[PDB]
Amino acid sequence: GRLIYTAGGYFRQSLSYLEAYNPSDGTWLRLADLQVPRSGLAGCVVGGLLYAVGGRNNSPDGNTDSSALDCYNPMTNQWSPCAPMSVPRNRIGVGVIDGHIYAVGGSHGCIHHNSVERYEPERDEWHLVAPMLTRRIGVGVAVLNRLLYAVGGFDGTNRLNSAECYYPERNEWRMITAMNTIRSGAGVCVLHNCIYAAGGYDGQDQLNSVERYDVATATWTFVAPMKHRRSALGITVHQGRIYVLGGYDGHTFLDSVECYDPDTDTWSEVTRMTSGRSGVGVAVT
Ligand SMILES: CC(=O)N1CCC[C@H]1C(=O)N[C@@H]1COC(=O)c2cccc(-c3ccc(C(=O)O)cc3)c2CSC[C@H](C(=O)N(C)C)NC1=O
Numbered sequence: 001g002r003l004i005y006t007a008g009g010y011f012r013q014s015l016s017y018l019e020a021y022n023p024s025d026g027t028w029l030r031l032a033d034l035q036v037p038r039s040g041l042a043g044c045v046v047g048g049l050l051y052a053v054g055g056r057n058n059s060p061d062g063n064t065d066s067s068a069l070d071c072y073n074p075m076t077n078q079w080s081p082c083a084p085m086s087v088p089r090n091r092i093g094v095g096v097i098d099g100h101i102y103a104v105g106g107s108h109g110c111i112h113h114n115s116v117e118r119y120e121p122e123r124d125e126w127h128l129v130a131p132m133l134t135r136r137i138g139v140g141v142a143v144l145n146r147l148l149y150a151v152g153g154f155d156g157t158n159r160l161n162s163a164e165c166y167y168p169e170r171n172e173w174r175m176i177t178a179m180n181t182i183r184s185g186a187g188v189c190v191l192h193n194c195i196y197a198a199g200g201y202d203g204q205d206q207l208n209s210v211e212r213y214d215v216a217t218a219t220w221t222f223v224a225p226m227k228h229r230r231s232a233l234g235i236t237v238h239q240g241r242i243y244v245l246g247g248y249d250g251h252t253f254l255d256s257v258e259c260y261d262p263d264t265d266t267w268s269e270v271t272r273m274t275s276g277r278s279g280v281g282v283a284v285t
Pocket residue numbers: 009010039040041058091092138153154159184185201203231232248278279280
């Protein structure tokens with residue numbers, strides 16, 4: 001059995017929570033807290049280990065952008081620090097190709113990154129790769145066909161509907177078809193050879209619309225929208241379904257967890273998190 005892990009988040013301040021949901025029985029497990037609270041981080045799994053990458057610790061007495069990479073071992077219930085990134089990256093996007101973690105964009109104070117770096121767990125090292133064509137904070141990242149897609153975000157001036165593709169073998173980025181909607185802080189994931197972009201912020205409101213990119217036709221098509229408008233949501237895929245966790249709807253930090261079934265094109269509320277929060281890092285193992 002696999003669990004959906006949710007790490008960090010924000011509710012009045014950045015959080016340390018690490019909790020795991022079991023879709024088979026609806027139970028939530030309270031696991032060991034992160035050593036440093038963080039929101040706007042991204043989660044991922046490599047070799048059965050959960051990684052929490054970047055983010056920011058917003059505390060009522062000061063904010064700190066994070067360049068940290070922390071590793072959680074489910075067998076020991078222990079977090080261990082890993083080599084930090086070259087720069088702090090809040091509102092980051094993460095993708096895994098061949099057991100290597102790609103940390104994409106994000107912010108560091110007044111800086112909106114276009115830089116991308118790759119982590120090698122076997123060596124415990126980070127190395128910069130080719131930067132994106134566009135600076136992107138709150139970027140959605142998805143791995144499809146061994147290519148890394150960077151979708152939407154905010155470049156410091158405009159929220160984006162554009163998306164680009166990284167070719168690891170060639171070390172280069174290329175623009176792909178832009179989405180129908182401008183989305184910053186959307187949940188981006190891949191399911192059945194399609195990239196889904198759910199929710200986000202279009203510059204005026206949080207979104208409940210969801211669209212998917214078909215690689216064969218290079219088009220984005222809207223599918224059923226979520227029941228709740230949400231930005232800075234967590235997203236993952238489990239047993240052929242998409243799960244969206246928490247987020248912010250413009251006033252409230254959501255506890256709602258929705259599930260998308262692609263066969264019926266429907267969303268449904270499956271559980272609630274123990275408390276409402278936004279900017280969580282999510283992964284399945
Ligand atoms: C104003 C502001 O951002 N805040 C004041 C200082 C602390 C900080 C604060 O409250 N952040 C917490 C955490 O949220 C994330 O982790 C988070 C994670 C990933 C992406 C994004 C994201 C960023 C920019 C845009 C875009 O503008 O295009 C869209 C999405 C966010 C921010 S979601 C907005 C919400 C907010 O503004 N208020 C006031 C509660 N922020 C949050 O939930």
